[PDB]
Write an enzyme that holds these catalytic residues in place. Structure first.
Site, PDB file in Angstrom:
ATOM      1  N   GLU A 124      -2.957 -16.053  -6.390  1.00  0.00           N
ATOM      2  CA  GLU A 124      -3.612 -16.075  -5.088  1.00  0.00           C
ATOM      3  C   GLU A 124      -4.798 -17.027  -5.089  1.00  0.00           C
ATOM      4  O   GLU A 124      -5.112 -17.635  -4.061  1.00  0.00           O
ATOM      5  CB  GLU A 124      -4.082 -14.667  -4.745  1.00  0.00           C
ATOM      6  CG  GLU A 124      -4.758 -14.520  -3.426  1.00  0.00           C
ATOM      7  CD  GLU A 124      -3.861 -14.948  -2.295  1.00  0.00           C
ATOM      8  OE1 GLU A 124      -4.366 -15.483  -1.292  1.00  0.00           O
ATOM      9  OE2 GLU A 124      -2.636 -14.752  -2.414  1.00  0.00           O
ATOM     10  N   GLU A 172      -8.927  -2.421  -3.168  1.00  0.00           N
ATOM     11  CA  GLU A 172      -8.339  -2.642  -1.852  1.00  0.00           C
ATOM     12  C   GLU A 172      -6.916  -3.173  -1.964  1.00  0.00           C
ATOM     13  O   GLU A 172      -6.066  -2.876  -1.119  1.00  0.00           O
ATOM     14  CB  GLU A 172      -9.218  -3.609  -1.060  1.00  0.00           C
ATOM     15  CG  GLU A 172      -8.666  -3.994   0.285  1.00  0.00           C
ATOM     16  CD  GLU A 172      -9.034  -5.404   0.683  1.00  0.00           C
ATOM     17  OE1 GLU A 172      -9.825  -6.039  -0.039  1.00  0.00           O
ATOM     18  OE2 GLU A 172      -8.527  -5.883   1.716  1.00  0.00           O
ATOM     19  N   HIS A 173      -6.634  -3.927  -3.022  1.00  0.00           N
ATOM     20  CA  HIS A 173      -5.332  -4.523  -3.246  1.00  0.00           C
ATOM     21  C   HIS A 173      -4.251  -3.505  -3.563  1.00  0.00           C
ATOM     22  O   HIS A 173      -3.074  -3.870  -3.560  1.00  0.00           O
ATOM     23  CB  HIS A 173      -5.428  -5.515  -4.399  1.00  0.00           C
ATOM     24  CG  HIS A 173      -4.532  -6.701  -4.263  1.00  0.00           C
ATOM     25  ND1 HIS A 173      -4.678  -7.631  -3.257  1.00  0.00           N
ATOM     26  CD2 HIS A 173      -3.482  -7.113  -5.010  1.00  0.00           C
ATOM     27  CE1 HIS A 173      -3.754  -8.565  -3.390  1.00  0.00           C
ATOM     28  NE2 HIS A 173      -3.014  -8.272  -4.445  1.00  0.00           N
TER      29      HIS A 173
END
Ligand SMILES: CCCCCCCCCCCCCCCCCC(=O)OC[C@H](COP(=O)([O-])OCC(O)COP(=O)([O-])OC[C@@H](COC(=O)CCCCCCCCCCCCCCCCC)OC(=O)CCCCCCCCCCCCCCCCC)OC(=O)CCCCCCCCCCCCCCCCC
Ligand SMILES: CCCCCCCC/C=C\CCCCCCCC(=O)OC[C@H](COP(=O)(O)OCCN)OC(=O)CCCCCCC/C=C\CCCCCCCC
Lengths: 445, 49, 106, 62
Positions: A136, A59-60
């Site tokens: 992150e 998804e990144h």
């Protein structure tokens, strides 16, 4: 224009199927805007430990290119129109949707089908997404409401697939290779696992036609002829506890077992959580409210906030509450929180039940305002029930609940059961496990 | 004076607390015959003489 | 009921005010009320030029009785200038309790 | 799933405190008469004879 006549005038939903087996649904409301996306069945539950963090890594990098729009050429083609893009992921869900102007509809569908069907795992752009992820992790290690809901899944499903986190352990991410990202996307990316949906100004017949043109070479057969099967996985009563004596406030959560998605017990469990309520220190008239928690914690200044959460899955659930508190007040929130759970499976009044039914009926109508919300409800209904449920049906279920129906369903789930507990510092007061467990039964009834 | 117990909902909750109490006399009837060695009640039961 | 004979009744109203002796010690009527929990909240709503007067009257009219005199006869609070400065702040606390009560009941 | 002895035992008379309290009263009542009889008997048999009963038949019904 009685509330009665307005429910059954909402436009209905059309569903169809393809030869590959993919499902296509829509709705139309005569306004100059649309929205389109794809909902698919994957998530972190479905994955072995060697692939704990894999699905968050794809998804990144879906927006970082493709094979025919090599990199920057993709986002410069959505901006000129003035449209947006998104992506999220949960234990069991993943999404990819767009939001544009009605007349750009053939163009929007092209861009979606070009991403889920053939994406470009360029090397040398791996090894750079990695460093964003590693860093992150630490910025949301300082968020305290997200590290306490990660504990409660790790202490009540102790030896299960449903315990491992979404973004994975911090050591799997540092050696998760490029070859491993091609098998997760080849096994869990195929019809009928995907859904294609739209709401707004869209017309079904041409939505169906475009679907033929762009999704004709989508693999539908499962690899190896392997088909997943769940396990009605276990729940245990367990505790977890972290001290940290240099933080200003304390965070605490607690839960028991709950129903599943298709269980018919859910509706009268919503009518009962709306009796407890919610609160925060910036409300108005918060010594004058209707809530047992709400009207007492404001007169004596006990807390900052509290809430009630019900999580649900295919085979397991949760039921509980969360509160953030001072350090000299931890076990006056337990004493009053549990005295309301027992008071509800024991005698529970009638007038208290019409008010909580009115609340639940406003939270249903209010939510479905927009084009992003309505479209997101259409494509999640399919993967969970089939047959998106009309609003006329949600109201004749709520016409059934009485005062006695609530008393049974509370006793069956709350009385004399084992809870799971999570806590984050500074807590020394938090009582021992033997004394939380003795508050689940009045010694009189 | 004593109307603070007399209300639409307050009269209802009695039915929520009679099933507990309406038994609570049977505990004493049995236990008393245990403790004070009642004979007349003990002569109704054929198991114990 | 009666009006013409009520002028008789007004007379006895002067008699009782002379029998009870809270005027002899320098007090007004509302200084002698028993403070249960409805009168503990209608005292915390007074303006601070009427709250202080009630404190000085009571502290002077309570050390007379550990000395066992009374005060000169010209100094007695006269009958008609007595003030009911606390009836209005109290016939509102009561009127709002009754309301929380019909709520819970019905 | 297979019915354990305690499975239906906990449901019927162990729930609130109420039937948890009835049986404690009734349990001793069906217990004291059985426990009293089988306790004295062993006292007699271990050394019967010697006691006063097992000779007083020499003085009975003339
Ligand atoms: C300090 C002294 C403790 C006494 C105050 C207890 C609070 C009383 C109360 O309202 O609870 C009702 C009381 C406590 O049980 P509960 O249902 O959990 O009530 C919740 C309490 O509000 C909340 O429960 P809690 O937080 O108070 O529990 C802490 C616990 C811990 O305290 C202890 O009991 C420690 C015991 C060891 C030392 C005791 C030495 C005492 C000298 O103390 C108890 O409550 C046990 C009370 C049992 C004795 C009373 C039995 C009556 C006969 O209910 C009953 O005991 C019912 C049993 C008798 C009913 C008879 C009715 C038919 C006639
Ligand atoms: C004789 C006629 C019939 C009598 C009936 C039977 C008599 C035998 C007594 C049997 C004992 C029964 C045990 C049950 C006692 C009880 O219920 O206590 C409850 C209570 C509940 O606490 P939680 O475990 O936290 O559970 C909370 C649930 N909501 O539990 C306990 O109290 C157990 C702890 C034991 C306490 C010991 C009490 C003895 C101390 C007495 C001090 C000495 C006094 C003598 C001096 C004279 C004083 C005037």
């Amino acid at each position: 224009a009685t509330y009665a006549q307005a429910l059954q005038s909402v436009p209905e939903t059309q569903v169809s199927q393809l030869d590959n087996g993919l499902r296509v649904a829509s709705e139309q409301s005569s306004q100059p805007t649309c929205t389109v996306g794809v909902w698919i069945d994957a998530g972190s539950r479905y994955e072995n430990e060697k692939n704990n963090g894999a699905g968050y890594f794809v998804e990144h990098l879906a927006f970082k290119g493709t094979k025919n729009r090599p990199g920057s050429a993709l986002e410069k083609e959505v901006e000129s129109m003035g449209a947006h893009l998104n992506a999220y992921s949960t234990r069991e869900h993943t999404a990819y949707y767009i939001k544009a102007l009605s007349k750009d509809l053939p163009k929007a569908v092209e861009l979606l089908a070009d991403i889920v069907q053939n994406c470009s795992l360029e090397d040398s752009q791996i090894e750079k997404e990695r460093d964003v992820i590693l860093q992150e992790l630490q910025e949301n290690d300082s968020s305290m409401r997200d590290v306490v809901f990660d504990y409660l899944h790790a202490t009540a499903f102790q030896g299960t697939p449903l315990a491992q986190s979404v973004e994975g352990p911090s050591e799997n991410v540092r050696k998760l290779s490029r070859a491993d990202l091609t098998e997760y996307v080849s096994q869990h990316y195929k019809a009928p696992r995907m859904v294609l949906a739209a709401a707004g100004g869209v017309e079904h017949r041409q939505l169906l036609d475009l679907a033929q043109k762009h999704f004709s070479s989508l693999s539908g057969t499962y690899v190896e002829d392997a088909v997943p099967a769940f396990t009605p996985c276990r729940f245990t009563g367990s505790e977890i506890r972290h001290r940290d004596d240099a933080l200003p406030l304390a965070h605490v959560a607690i839960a028991v077992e709950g129903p599943g998605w298709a269980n018919p017990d859910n509706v009268p469990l919503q009518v009962a959580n709306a009796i407890i309520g919610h609160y925060d220190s910036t409300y108005g008239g918060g010594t004058h409210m209707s809530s047992t928690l709400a009207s007492v914690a404001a007169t004596r200044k006990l807390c900052q906030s509290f809430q009630t959460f019900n999580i649900c899955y295919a085979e397991t659930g949760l039921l509980g509450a969360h509160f953030v508190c001072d350090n000299m007040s931890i076990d006056d929130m337990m004493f009053f929180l549990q005295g309301q759970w027992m008071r509800l499976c024991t005698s529970a009044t009638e007038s208290e039940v019409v008010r909580g039914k009115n609340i639940l009926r406003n939270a249903l109508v209010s939510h479905l305002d927009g084009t992003t919300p309505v479209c997101e409800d259409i494509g999640r209904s399919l993967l969970t029930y089939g047959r998106r449920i009309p609003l006329a049906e949600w109201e004749s279920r709520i016409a059934e609940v009485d005062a006695s129906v609530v008393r049974e369903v509370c006793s069956k789930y709350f009385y004399d059961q084992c809870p799971a507990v999570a806590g984050l510092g500074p807590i020394e007061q938090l009582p021992d496990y033997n004394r939380i467990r003795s508050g689940m039964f009045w010694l009189r009834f | 004076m004593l109307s603070r117990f007399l209300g639409p909902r307050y009269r209802e909750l009695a039915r929520n607390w009679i099933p507990t109490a309406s038994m609570w006399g049977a505990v004493g009837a049995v236990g008393l015959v245990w403790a004070t060695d009642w004979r007349l009640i003990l002569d109704w039961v054929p198991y114990i003489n | 009921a009666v009006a013409a004979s009520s002028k008789w009744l007004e007379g006895i109203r002067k008699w009782y005010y002379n029998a009870a002796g809270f005027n002899k010690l320098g007090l007004m009527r509302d200084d002698t009320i028993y403070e249960d929990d409805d009168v503990k909240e209608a005292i915390r709503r007074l303006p601070e030029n009427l709250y202080n007067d009630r404190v000085f009257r009571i502290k002077r009219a309570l050390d007379l009785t550990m000395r066992q005199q009374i005060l000169p006869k010209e100094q007695w609070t006269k009958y008609e200038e007595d003030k009911f400065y606390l009836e209005p702040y109290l016939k509102e606390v009561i009127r709002e309790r009754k309301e929380r009560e019909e709520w819970a009941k019905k | 799933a297979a019915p354990t002895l305690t499975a239906r035992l906990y449901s019927l008379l162990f729930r609130r405190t109420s039937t948890f309290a009835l049986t404690i009263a009734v349990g001793a009542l069906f217990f004291e008469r059985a426990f009293d009889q089988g306790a004295d008997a062993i006292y007699e048999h271990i050394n019967q004879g010697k006691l006063w009963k097992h000779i007083k038949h020499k003085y009975e019904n003339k």
